[PDB]
Structures are given as structure tokens and as C-alpha cells.
Amino acid sequence: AMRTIYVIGIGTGSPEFLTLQAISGLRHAQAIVALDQKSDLLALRQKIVDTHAPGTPIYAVTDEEEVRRWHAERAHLLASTIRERTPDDGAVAFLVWGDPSLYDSTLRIIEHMRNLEDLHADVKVIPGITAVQVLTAEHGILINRIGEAIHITTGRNLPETSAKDRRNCVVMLDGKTAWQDVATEHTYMWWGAFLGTEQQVLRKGYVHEIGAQVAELKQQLRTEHGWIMDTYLLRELD
Numbered sequence: 653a654m655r656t657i658y659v660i661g662i663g664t665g666s667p668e669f670l671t672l673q674a675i676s677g678l679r680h681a682q683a684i685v686a687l688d689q690k691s692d693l694l695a696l697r698q699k700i701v702d703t704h705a706p707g708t709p710i711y712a713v714t715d716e717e718e719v720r721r722w723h724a725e726r727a728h729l730l731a732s733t734i735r736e737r738t739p740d741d742g743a744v745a746f747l748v749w750g751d752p753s754l755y756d757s758t759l760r761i762i763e764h765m766r767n768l769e770d771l772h773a774d775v776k777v778i779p780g781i782t783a784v785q786v787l788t789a790e791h792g793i794l795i796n797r798i799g800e801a802i803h804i805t806t807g808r809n810l811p812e813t814s815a816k817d818r819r820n821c822v823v824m825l826d827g828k829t830a831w832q833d834v835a836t837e838h839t840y841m842w843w844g845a846f847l848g849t850e851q852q853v854l855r856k857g858y859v860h861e862i863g864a865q866v867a868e869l870k871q872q873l874r875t876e877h878g879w880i881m882d883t884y885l886l887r888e889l890d
């Protein structure tokens with residue numbers, strides 16, 4: 653009939669964040685794919701699979717005109733791999749850090765690939781715990797004040813974000829230190845890096861007070877580990 657493609661959120665930093673639904677999907681997949689270096693992450697991901705889908709290898713796919721050429725080749729690669737490793741009624745799982753819906757290209761890639769390679773499949777998305785949810789849980793805070801909007805955005809977008817939206821915003825994908833550029837005396841920040849993991853680091857306080865310190869810390873950690881992923885929440889406590 654058709655194959656099932658599970659797109660499975662595997663959470664952030666720890667195997668404890670996996671849902672029952674995710675575990676069922678992993679255990680029923682006849683093949684596992686991940687579109688991707690960060691050795692710590694590869695190791696965490698393998699640990700999740702070793703625990704729940706032991707005996708199933710992870711097929712990890714890694715990267716002008718060249719990008720467009722790579723996408724076509726990647727599409728052919730994915731379709732061929734799926735057809736080889738699963739029967740016509742079988743199931744493949746794609747692993748996605750956090751939740752598949754949030755700042756991730758896997759679903760888009762799958763949809764493009766299916767169209768280009770004429771791959772008949774039922775796509776089923778399985779939610780997972782996002783970095784945002786780990787940040788708020790580890791700090792023991794609410795993501796909003798009563799009735800308040802929540803603006804989730806990127807470091808690149810932050811300087812162009814309205815003051816009104818910056819009253820309660822979550823910032824992802826910040827390669828720099830964008831809190832320094834938008835803070836007032838009332839701006840409070842909850843920050844975290846390597847959330848969920850044994851190398852988790854949390855900081856909080858007024859940007860007035862801690863912003864330069866966290867900027868220094870983020871560089872220290874990046875030099876040490878070779879990379880860093882942080883998420884933070886800014887709130888105007890006026």
C-alpha cells in the first residue's frame with residue numbers, strides 16, 4: 653500500500669524527555685534517518701536509539717548552485733534509502749531534536765523529497781519537548797504573565813522586533829549576544845545553554861547586571877566545546 657514516515661521529536665538534552673508516542677514510533681520503525689559536527693549530540697542521539705530501538709542503525713545524512721544540486725542528490729538518496737530499507741508497507745522514522753515543528757527543516761525536506769521522487773507515504777508527526785520548554789521548566793518559570801503574548805523569534809530578528817513584543821519574548825538561533833542590543837534597565841533575562849544535558853548552564857537576572865557576564869560565558873563555552881546552543885527569555889519587568 654504505502655509506507656509510513658514518522659517524523660519524531662526526540663526532545664532536548666536528555667532521554668527522560670521522550671514521549672510514549674515517540675518510543676512507540678522508534679520501536680516500530682524498520683529504518684531510522686536523521687538529517688544533520690557536534691559529537692556530543694550524535695552520542696546523545698545514539699544513546700536514545702540504543703535504549704529504545706536497539707538493533708536499528710541511524711542513517712545520518714550530512715551536507716549557490718551547489719546547494720540546489722545537493723538538495724536534488726539528497727532527495728534521491730533519501731528515497732532510495734527508504735525503499736531499500738523498508739518494505740512497501742513498512743515504516744521509517746526521521747529523528748528531529750526537540751519538536752519537529754519548531755525551527756527545523758525536516759518536514760519541508762520530506763515533502764520536497766516525496767514530490768520529486770514520487771515516494772508514496774503517510775507522514776505522521778510525533779511531538780517532542782522543545783528547548784523553550786526545557787528553559788522554562790529548568791528555571792521554574794511561566795512563559796507568559798497573565799493574558800500576555802509570547803513572541804518567539806531569532807537572534808537575527810530581535811533588533812527589528814517591536815518594543816511591545818520584546819516585553820515577553822523567547823530568542824533562539826542567536827549566534828551572537830542580542831540581549832545586549834535591546835535591553836533597558838527593566839529587561840530581565842532567563843538564559844540557558846546545553847539545556848537538558850549534563851553540561852547544562854543556567855543564568856538569570858537583569859540584563860543591566862548580568863548581560864556582559866553572560867556574553868563572556870557564552871564565548872568561554874563556545875571556545876571550550878567548539879559550539880554552543882542557547883535559548884533565552886527576555887521580559888520587561890517595569
Ligand SMILES: C[S@@+](CC[C@H](N)C(=O)[O-])C[C@H]1O[C@@H](n2cnc3c(N)ncnc32)[C@H](O)[C@@H]1O
Pocket residue numbers: 664665748749750751752753754755756781782783784823824825826844845846847848881882883
Ligand atoms: C535548529 S533550532 C531547533 C529547535 C528544536 N526543533 C526545538 O524544538 O527546540 C536550534 C535552536 O534551538 C535552541 N536549542 C536547541 N537545543 C538546545 C539546547 N540543548 N540548549 C539550549 N538551546 C537549544 C537554540 O536556540 C538553537 O539555536
Ligand SMILES: [Mg+2]
Pocket residue numbers: 838889890
Ligand atoms: Mg523590575
